[model samples]
Target: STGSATTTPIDSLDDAYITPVQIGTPAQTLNLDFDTGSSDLWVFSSETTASEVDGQTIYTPSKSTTAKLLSGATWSISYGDGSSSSGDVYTDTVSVGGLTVTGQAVESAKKVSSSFTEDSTIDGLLGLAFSTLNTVSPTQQKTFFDNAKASLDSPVFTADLGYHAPGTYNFGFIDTTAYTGSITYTAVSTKQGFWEWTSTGYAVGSGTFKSTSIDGIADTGTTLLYLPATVVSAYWAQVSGAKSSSSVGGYVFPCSATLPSFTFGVGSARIVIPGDYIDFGPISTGSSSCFGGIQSSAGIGINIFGDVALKAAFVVFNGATTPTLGFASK
Candidate 1:
């Protein structure tokens, strides 16, 4: 971990860690979705010629050569587990995994959310957690650690979110040695950047949520947490034969029952939420059911808490230490 660039311009862009500053420099390796509810760094353009919706890192600012379009503030966002997009704020010279992050500053969304214009197949979204829900805009907008903190050698960046979905979202550290420590700086009120938050209460697996009337804000850009109906009939009267089949709207249950596990009290800790998350990905709900914790709101909108209760823990939307939002352990 060497050092050098420190003229001091990045007071803190909410944990900055962006990548994409173009001019023809990418044939592959590109990754985004560092979203902590919002920050903005969408990719998957080569004018998205409709490759059937693709952007897990499919950047193509005219195949770079240094893409740049900057300005217009036309970006759009909408998470909370529903999804949304609409971009137009560019500047390029990006690359990832091999790391580049030059001119940076992006938000080329062109209308997404329908799981990113589905029927095509999803691509683009990198908000990389913490700092309220940044949609960047203090005049412009930037993150990916404020445009790669002078080419990041390390001042800290940790998104070890794999095994569930972040599997390798590493920016600076978090694996440079199990995330060593000694860089918790926290101190940004607003140099522009956005994505706001402040909920120190919500988690239901490792226990510790006296209840925030049923809790949820735990966003990773929300994949679900739309709950209501008195919080899913008080969580189906607390698991076990949680019957109420109105013909499947949320809780299908019986992946064999016996599941009493839950939590969402956050503040002094308690974020575990993992009972197979809600059993999807060809898991169950028919082969003997096994999908509960409030879904099928019939009309929809309430009781989402997506990403299946956030893959059971490891969230950290700390907003530079006051905006608060927490969770821990891998």
Candidate 2:
């Protein structure tokens, strides 16, 4: 009825979080990115071209007696970063942590982008967004959470993402001790198939809170926080040597610059992101300029409260009759 799993960052920059998943009868363990922004459980598999396979794990359905081909089913997904993958589908026994789901749709990758091939830390992605966002053709598939919701003690899951250290993902029930203080609940809109909600406002460093509505999705898959240009510019302007460089493709500042903390509102509750977290390492190896963890969302078309923001607080993806989001200090 309940389950829990530990997730860790793939690199020093916390580029992506990866959790181990068990697939097939013999239990082929592969580390997958638990992405809350997309809805499609896809993995690298035996069908993937050898040339495209890097130092990553692969799932072989042929080895699992429980694996059954989902005839006529196909899936393809493209990310905002231009990375993509497409593959056929299979139904098999899949398990995460101690929770098991029978006949779970397991998409096996046949074609993958070069970016995916190069990321050896993750084998694939496990989408936690609504099933409506599933890219499967003919017959859409339910996400692991959606399929397991009915049997769970409660239809809720929590994300406790960490900065550099390991964090946890809990399903079916909330762990009161995982967070401090009371949770601030907010209405969520599932029409976009994302955990989308509007924050009350934001503040730069110790400045006054700007009372405005900032709508965005809480995406665990994305690495940085993206907000409107106005908000991003205001935050960067406080840094002495920060500038928006076209050549670098984003705002960057001197590595030694003293960055300021960022605060955002969830109802009356305010979550503060430490300044050190915003300094997202150097732009290149041995470079003196560091890239910022927060950037403009203009090109993305929508604001993204990604890992940079999520790591600052505990996030709950409450799948109630009328879904809502909960944020609390950790």
Candidate 3:
């Protein structure tokens, strides 16, 4: 919520926190849902000549002074959000801050639905999560990170969505000077490239997890922490007034009390999620009440800490090293 007043020192608005990338590179930046569960860069444009969306980012050569449309290639994308777009391939140089990676592969949607135009803007999204479910074309493209990695002095990348002002997206390597101490760097798990988690049963404040030795994928794409019911209950038990309320999702909590501080042990690495997020109030979907932090997955066993947890720290993604993800900023 605070602007550039981060605990860490800020880099040059011009030198760091951004990069210029292209489409069709082994790693290009197309607008897509950046989900480790789903991998695809879906670009959006204000144009349409044909109909329907192909899975991928759609860019308009006109809107982007740096873009060139691919003549023969065709593409489309459909999202869980029930939106779709389709069009031909386009090449462009996308600028982030002052850096520019050119000729990256991208899609252009010539056809789209009305609701598609509502919240999406500025080309499309670049999925920085993982390559688990990538929808790559035979053309062989590099990702946005892949293109920029070579030029960066450091083989790393960072995203500070906690913007100083609304509408501003901070990217690139974080100024290490921002923090009071050095970042606890951890090797990214190659299998998924995310900061994996461990259940160890759940606990609040200083209580240790019942098992304290299980692990799961930690996703940044998701909006809230999605933990198994058992873990949720165990965690709530540690809270003094923590009580389960059907009205606020299913998470048991004191509702008004702030969460106590806790530390997660992953290997020799320890990560801390501030109490503000650890102690969420209630889950409200429309008018129905559900458990907020601890939810019943039923058919889902994979526990994930979505944006609610991921946003707390400065997130770094290092694609320069293949088969692995890299992270820092404790």
Candidate 4:
């Protein structure tokens, strides 16, 4: 059977969206963050230390009839945002909506960073990226989507991310009514184990579009948009009182600055991002300054079209041959 789930942003942060997933035999429900940038199914589990769990729900493998420890196997991951988690592996039945995989590798987190420990709502992450990104040692693991794709009508999934609003994630099926206009499909490069694509060009404010191809990954777990430093500087140049602040560690501008909308070209499509969305949030101080959501991707080696950009489009992650990325207006 096909599967789908409605996703909601946590605390209206737009940082990440959470979906309910059932793991183990009798079905232990956990609210997992669906991340497109990385691969690996991990959760806060009984192996987690009491001081690190906070208010999040823990998945107890011992209590599940279908759970089996993967002897001598372990996994760990450090996110781009600096948060990290590590643990052992367990094989179990993992279900999402109407679809279930009988032998899914579910990593049980025994260690988590302060960021994860402080945020109690997110039980773990269900990675939707390529299976090659799985971190399990010795024998690698496959994602739930990869395992369930064979029985699906189409090897595809669509992500309808929203702005401080509710969205839906559909697996193995595309609901045409979820988006407007014809979907523009672009070829994806899976050599990086991400929904990697290249933009034809971009325009800052209402300025002339520069034909600079930008290679990047579409990431649902990340909060802001990251591009090359030169591109970031060009966009912020249109805004008054904007500066690359070492204090803020990136770009910052006066809260009252008249910001201009940014646009990125994907094939024949031009996705316009509103000006207000660029202003991520206020800086730490009680000053009239705000951080820019668009920052540099210099050190990271790749640009990231994070939630700020993804929310503006209806994205279809096609798992079929060549894995084309289909985009449309919401």
Candidate 5:
């Protein structure tokens, strides 16, 4: 009734995290991005166009006796960055960590965008968000998390994202030893199919906490933290030589500049993000200009608390009827 899995960062910048997933009858293991921002367990497979297949592993449904085509079912998903993938669907036995789900929908990509082909580290995505966001047509399929929730000890999954280190994803039960201090719980609004919650406030370094309700989604799929322009500007203002660069597409500062830590509130609990976490590597391989991990969300519509913030604490997506989110410092 319980399961756990390790997630490793794909790059030094912690651009993304990948977890091993077992699928089909013989258990074909592939590294998948456990994305909380979407609801579709899709993967690169033998069905994918040969041109789109790079160094990533492919799932061959033909090899699995339990695999059955979901006739007439199809799915297509496009991200904010314009990257996309689409294909038909199949139902098969799928397992993660130690949890197993029978008849789990496994979307086989028939076509994938160039961005996905270029990324050799990720074979596909395993969505952990509400199933309402599923893209399957004619019949909506539940996510791996949703399908396995009923068999779990508790209908909840937790994310412990690490910085330049291996983290973990726990299902059915919370690992008390994975985090420090008492967890602060907050109500989640699943209307948009995301783990959306309102952050109590924010503070720059040691400054006083700004009392404001900032609504955002805890998205592990996304790589950076995005907040309001005001909040982003406030943090950058404290850093010498930092500027919002048009060429770089975000706030950039001298790599040698002293960066300040960022803190955000979850109910009464405040999670602090280290300064080094904000210095999101250099603009170029050896450039002296560095991009900031926290950027303005003005263009994103809704604020996003991505890996930059998620790595600062342990996050719980409680799937009770009245879904709630829990945050705890580590």
Candidate 6:
């Protein structure tokens, strides 16, 4: 059987997109951010410190007959943005849309950083990355996707992220109507527990495509597109008055600038990010300055094709023997 869910974006697309997921028996539903950057099915739970639980929904294990403590199992994770969470583990029935996993590790948070607690609507995170990245200690955990893959018609999932709009995420199946044109495929290196791949080249707007290869990960959890410093500089050069703003951070320019689209190549395939999307919106309300969503991933060796880049195309995560990343214009 196949599974799918509608993803909704909050915080002006600068934050994460969320999808509904059900956990445990009787199915306690929560809005989770389906993240491909990390692996761990963690949630704000009844176990969370009272002070830490704000407006977010909490998953209560006592209410679920299928919930079982993993005894001695615990998980701790720190994200790229510095947000962190640590918790105890339980085995429970986890379902996404129509697909269900009978015994999946559910990390119930005992502690969470302000980054997560402030996001009132985000109940947890559903990791789509490789299970090897799972942070649960002593006994590692498997992602819901991996546990349910054997029953899926196909071992693939597609991400159709959008900008200030609703999108769809499909498991075990692909809906051709979700995207247009043919799909381009590329081999991915899962050594880092990420869908890492190298771009054949890239171009700024309609400019000539440069043949500089860029190694990056397709990370749905990240909010911005982070590339090499040189690549970032080239793109900012096109925008008049653009500069690295110490206050705003990263590149910023006149909000009225005629921004150009950015393109990344995957062999013969060309995926382009519209100019408007790169301008993450005004620096603040009524401000004439805007921040660029594409920034430098300096200090961090690998570039990150975050939501800013992923929303530009329909992406397929093919988990066959040789994992592949397929992209097509959306």
Top-scoring candidate (lDDT): 5
* Off by more than 4 A, model 4: none
The best-first sequence of candidates by lDDT reads 5, 2, 6, 4, 3, 1
Error of 5 at 283 (Å): 1.4
lDDT of 5: 0.95
Tens digit per residue, CA lDDT, model 6, 274-311: 99889777888899988888899997778999999999
Candidate 6 residue runs with Cα over 4 Å from true position: none
Error of 5 at 104 (Å): 0.4
Taking every candidate in turn, the Cα RMSD to the unseen true structure, in Å, is 16.1, 0.7, 7.6, 1.4, 0.7, 1.1
lDDT of 2 by residue, 1-330 (tens): 988999999999999999999999999999999999999999999999888899999999999999999999999999989999999999998888888889899999999999999998899999999999999999999999998899889999999999889999988999999999999999999999999999999999999999999999999999999999999999999999899999998999999998999999999999999998898889999999999999999989999999999999999999998999999998
**For model 1, what is the alpha-carbon lDDT of residue 271?**
47
The per-candidate count of clashes, in order, stands at 72, 0, 52, 0, 0, 0
Tens-digit lDDT string for candidate 5 (1-330)? 998999999988999999999999899999999999999999999999999999999999999999999999999999766899999999999998999999999999999999999999999999988999999999999999899988999999999999999999999999999999899999999999999999999999999999899999999999999999999999999998999998879999999988899999999899999999898879988999999999999988999999999999999999999999999999
**Model 4 RMSD vs true structure:** 1.4
| TM-score of each model, in listed order | 0.31, 0.99, 0.66, 0.96, 0.99, 0.97
Model 5: residue 148 alpha-carbon error in angstroms: 0.8
lDDT of each: 0.47, 0.94, 0.48, 0.90, 0.95, 0.90
Worst 10 residues of 1 by lDDT: 6-15
Tell me how far the alpha carbon of residue 25 in candidate 3 is from the true structure, in angstroms, after superposition: 18
What's the ranking of the predictions by TM-score, best on top? 2, 5, 6, 4, 3, 1
User: 112-152 in candidate 3: lDDT tens per residue?
Assistant: 66555543322454545554434445454555555656676
TM-score of 3: 0.66
Alpha carbon lDDT of residue 42, candidate 6? 95
Supply the global lDDT for candidate 3.
0.48
